[PDB]
Amino acid sequence: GLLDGKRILVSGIITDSSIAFHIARVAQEQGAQLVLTGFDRLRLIQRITDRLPAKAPLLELDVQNEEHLASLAGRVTEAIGAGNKLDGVVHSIGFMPQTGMGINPFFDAPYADVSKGIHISAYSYASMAKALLPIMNPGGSIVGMDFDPSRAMPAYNWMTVAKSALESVNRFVAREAGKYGVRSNLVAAGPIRTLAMSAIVGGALGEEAGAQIQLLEEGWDQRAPIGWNMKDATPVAKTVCALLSDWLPATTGDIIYADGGAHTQLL
Amino acid sequence: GLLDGKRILVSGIITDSSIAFHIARVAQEQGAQLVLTGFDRLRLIQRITDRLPAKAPLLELDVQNEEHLASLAGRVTEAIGAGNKLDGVVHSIGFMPQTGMGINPFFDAPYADVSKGIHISAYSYASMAKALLPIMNPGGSIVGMDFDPSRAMPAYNWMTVAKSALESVNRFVAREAGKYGVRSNLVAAGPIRTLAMSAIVGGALGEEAGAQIQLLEEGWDQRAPIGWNMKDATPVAKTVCALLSDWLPATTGDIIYADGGAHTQLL
Amino acid sequence: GLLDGKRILVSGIITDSSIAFHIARVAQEQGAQLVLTGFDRLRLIQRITDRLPAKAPLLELDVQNEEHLASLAGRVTEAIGAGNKLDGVVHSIGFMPQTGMGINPFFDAPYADVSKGIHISAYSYASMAKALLPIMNPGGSIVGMDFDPSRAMPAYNWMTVAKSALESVNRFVAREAGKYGVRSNLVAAGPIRTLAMSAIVGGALGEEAGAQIQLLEEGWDQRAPIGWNMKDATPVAKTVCALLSDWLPATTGDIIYADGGAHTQLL
Amino acid sequence: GLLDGKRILVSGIITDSSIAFHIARVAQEQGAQLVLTGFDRLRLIQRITDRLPAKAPLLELDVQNEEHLASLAGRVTEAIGAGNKLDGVVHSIGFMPQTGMGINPFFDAPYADVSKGIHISAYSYASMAKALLPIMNPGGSIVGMDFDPSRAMPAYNWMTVAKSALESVNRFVAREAGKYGVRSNLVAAGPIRTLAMSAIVGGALGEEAGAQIQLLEEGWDQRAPIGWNMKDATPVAKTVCALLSDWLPATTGDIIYADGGAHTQLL
């Protein structure tokens, strides 16, 4: 197994189409022992993660809750056993209020909404690293999820801004994590048909926003030299496991693109 | 004059070493008629701007104040006369609480502090565009100030993250401004010895943070193929005026580097 | 005039749709005194440049001819008068044999053809700087023409590779030019309907290559927040003059995008 | 083994400090069956590769020799057996005449020398892909070696330009390779003390060029959040094997940085 013997925390499962669900499944297939964290609907999340190939302890973590973060390391150590540390951490968390995405005009998003989205989607990457680095082994790996924000696009709006912030946060987290012998990187994935994404294409955030996201998805597969299957998160999950493994040992502060090569092609 | 007949709003003057003070001076030398905006210390700012080559109306603008922003367009129109519109807008505004910069550990900045810094330094670029685009002429220009955040560095810490967000905001503001025939761009300047910068090098944010910023400044002049004079903001001011003029008419959503060429050289 | 009193060499005119023809016209409108260089068809080029607003001496320059390059500085000094130096140099030169572009498979371009294209399109930027820097004034400006090669695209093929090389060459030319007080930069233009470009869209390099270039042009105007008019080279010419002026005095080794903002937008 | 059962061609071994020697060693440790290619000194190369953990057939390949390239696929098939195809190809080849590197002035490199360096270092990546893609399996991987050329630097000079060209070539090779189900990527490594590199630091290309390269190496380890050991090529070799494996299945046309994170940090 690629991750045999490694102890890895995976955040961000909410449904069986969550990117983090497939990260967790592939990691377990590769021998990793997992600790899961979930937000708000913990009964639902437990029922979802019962379908993973192996049982895993589930801990509550709202990344806006300073008490959850202050206790997180101790709860993880209780789950994996005293004297054991984590080898990996997966941040697979995002949120932006509806005013910050969709046909809702970019200029009409109130800052309270934008600030909440940047808190959950970018600042919390630093929050989780702060909480967990003291219980991570040298040679460890922190990985977060990205959507390439280097160019503007329709509908993503303030979530794009939050991803630009996250990429910057990742480069500073790498500075801190390096003191522990730990790497920090992001995986920039192409579009994946999660439940939230399927709802947006169906028009949950306005019709023309849904139309624009559908055109974005089509252009992605067209641009990708090896194609892009938005219905299959496994290539993204394998890329996250590659970063969690010992096989990218000199990469940190960086972004790995699991997007079919689409960002390397103009058309 | 490069800006003869143009009506341009300039924010961000606080002392005579403010980058915006030199933007305003050069713009007036080139024939522009200015409206100035200032924050908090308006008595001080009026006394500072009395030294500009021409008189200019001074309006109060705290970019965190929704009432200031909601009234801004009407107060500008009163200042320049009904039936007149702006040709240019300069955003030269930044702030990050001390916990977000310096020797203060990156992980120890509370989100309330970071969110305030991102509000003032990044979100407000969209706020000012929202307020002022309805009173801007086609062919107009919005310019904001940037410090290249594409790589992490010592001490800049969460202000770097705010600049990463600002660059993303600029690309979305360009989308909105294009509907008005208006361009939006940032000038990424090299380090300039403002009062705040001089204080930081003197150790106001911790000794080793000051030591690191001094080493950053020295490397900048070394890297720049034409050199870099941190005591001279005029090259930055001229670059802002170039973007405010009609001579970069096909550039928008973009970043112009007024840094001596330092970002193009590794060493 | 933006360029009043400046002495500027402009290469690359071959027809009245040449980007360099419009660079020269705008520069003369702004008070510059020009020296022109032309390749192979000097009778044709003289007849074309007779239509510029002012007379200008025309010198022969094949950038693959070491004798033309070794004599160029002396011929320029003869044209502008002893004791006079150049303030500006415009490189607006490109060529790639047909095997290196179009439907002709990327793998089938022989290296002899590719090497000729890289010689004319990239190496010659260093050749011209070597020849002309000894007769350039401090504060001078060298500008070359670019087409953004950061992503692959259909048909451009090995010309894309040549532009990637040119961007690298520009950063090294900036190092050398800085010793003379001279800046070096590229303007990355959007697509312009030159005679060669019109022929390619008409299918001169294969039908599907023409189809792909037409789709590229359409997407460009769609992406550009201020639009893009491929029939109008004046915005590109003005951007070149901006770099030749004193108004971007701290930019070197760099690329200015005169593309409507298209490269800042995904769709 | 990470590469169990895979058949992989590895070019570029010349001494036991060659990056390709360590790529080959790690690949064999991970279960790959290798075919090696070598240039000019095949007796020497055979003696060097006798020290690899497993025997491997050695084929002659001068990438400037069209006859070597036209016969390469048939010689590989003979070596691995009819009906067998390659799963991986490693391009680890570079050369630039001395006039193109070191204290030798950038402007003094003759184009014949530069063209030879671009032939060997960049064009040959397309040449090898053209020769070998017809005998590669779907799911295969082509990997080449890069040194980040996005900024100019002392001494690397025209080799930097060749790497800029190589990055562009890689994006076009990805387009062709995708038709075969094959990925193409580069690994941008930090500095490694090969025999050639040790000689350059010792002054083989001029004293100040050696001084500048030594300062470059020191800054690299300083910048890298996890450090950088120029005496240890194993982290680079493991990264190449990661790309040769099935664990980065949605990455193509891309660059993976095995540099300690140095390129993500300003200082």
Ligand SMILES: NC(=O)c1ccc[n+]([C@@H]2O[C@H](COP(=O)([O-])OP(=O)(O)OC[C@H]3O[C@@H](n4cnc5c(N)ncnc54)[C@H](O)[C@@H]3O)[C@@H](O)[C@H]2O)c1
């Ligand atoms: N689906 C795509 O197209 C795509 C593409 C690239 C990147 N990503 C990224 O992957 C991450 C989310 O992935 P997803 O697509 O699997 O969607 P998802 O809805 O399945 O996952 C979002 C997760 O964020 C978690 N979350 C929200 N608020 C939280 C909080 N206060 N505390 C803790 N967790 C919280 C949700 O509970 C949920 O588990 C995000 O970073 C997203 O941007 C998604």
Ligand SMILES: NC(=O)c1ccc[n+]([C@@H]2O[C@H](COP(=O)([O-])OP(=O)(O)OC[C@H]3O[C@@H](n4cnc5c(N)ncnc54)[C@H](O)[C@@H]3O)[C@@H](O)[C@H]2O)c1
């Ligand atoms: N000095 C440098 O080295 C440097 C380099 C690159 C970019 N910049 C950028 O230039 C901008 C600030 O420039 P400066 O260096 O001239 O420093 P400065 O201290 O002279 O200007 C900062 C300005 O921000 C304004 N400001 C702060 N809070 C505000 C609010 N709530 N509402 C309105 N205005 C507010 C201040 O009043 C002040 O006028 C910033 O965007 C800064 O990041 C500076």
Ligand SMILES: NC(=O)c1ccc[n+]([C@@H]2O[C@H](COP(=O)([O-])OP(=O)(O)OC[C@H]3O[C@@H](n4cnc5c(N)ncnc54)[C@H](O)[C@@H]3O)[C@@H](O)[C@H]2O)c1
């Ligand atoms: N037209 C576009 O879409 C576009 C877009 C961006 C950049 N550019 C760039 O602008 C430059 C060429 O511009 P153009 O579009 O105006 O086409 P053009 O055909 O009008 O100009 C090409 C010029 O290259 C010159 N040239 C060719 N070989 C030469 C040699 N051996 N010595 C000296 N000169 C030689 C030609 O004589 C001709 O004057 C090129 O660098 C091109 O890549 C063009």
Ligand SMILES: NC(=O)c1ccc[n+]([C@@H]2O[C@H](COP(=O)([O-])OP(=O)(O)OC[C@H]3O[C@@H](n4cnc5c(N)ncnc54)[C@H](O)[C@@H]3O)[C@@H](O)[C@H]2O)c1
């Ligand atoms: N050593 C470093 O610091 C470093 C860093 C990043 C990337 N790289 C890259 O790794 C590759 C070379 O690696 P190295 O550092 O292991 O040096 P090396 O001297 O050990 O390898 C160079 C290889 O190029 C081969 N070669 C030269 N001409 C050839 C030809 N005509 N045909 C076939 N092969 C030819 C040599 O025979 C030799 O095997 C190059 O692409 C180099 O740029 C090196």
Ligand SMILES: O=C(O)c1ccccc1C(=O)c1ccc(Cl)c([N+](=O)[O-])c1
């Ligand atoms: O990114 C998120 O965290 C997110 C938050 C809420 C809803 C969906 C997403 C999401 O993953 C996403 C990915 C790509 C695109 Cl193109 C869009 N989009 O423009 O709608 C969304």
Ligand SMILES: O=C(O)c1ccccc1C(=O)c1ccc(Cl)c([N+](=O)[O-])c1
């Ligand atoms: O950027 C700002 O708005 C700002 C806010 C407060 C104090 C100074 C600055 C500032 O302009 C700045 C520029 C460059 C650098 Cl390197 C630093 N720094 O690291 O300290 C600061």
Ligand SMILES: O=C(O)c1ccccc1C(=O)c1ccc(Cl)c([N+](=O)[O-])c1
């Ligand atoms: O770039 C050149 O120098 C050039 C050489 C010969 C023919 C045309 C061009 C040219 O300018 C060009 C610009 C954009 C595009 Cl998209 C293409 N293209 O793909 O065909 C060509």
Ligand SMILES: O=C(O)c1ccccc1C(=O)c1ccc(Cl)c([N+](=O)[O-])c1
């Ligand atoms: O890159 C090559 O192929 C190469 C060719 C000949 C000699 C050494 C190298 C080489 O690998 C290299 C790597 C980094 C640096 Cl910084 C330098 N350098 O500036 O001398 C060389």
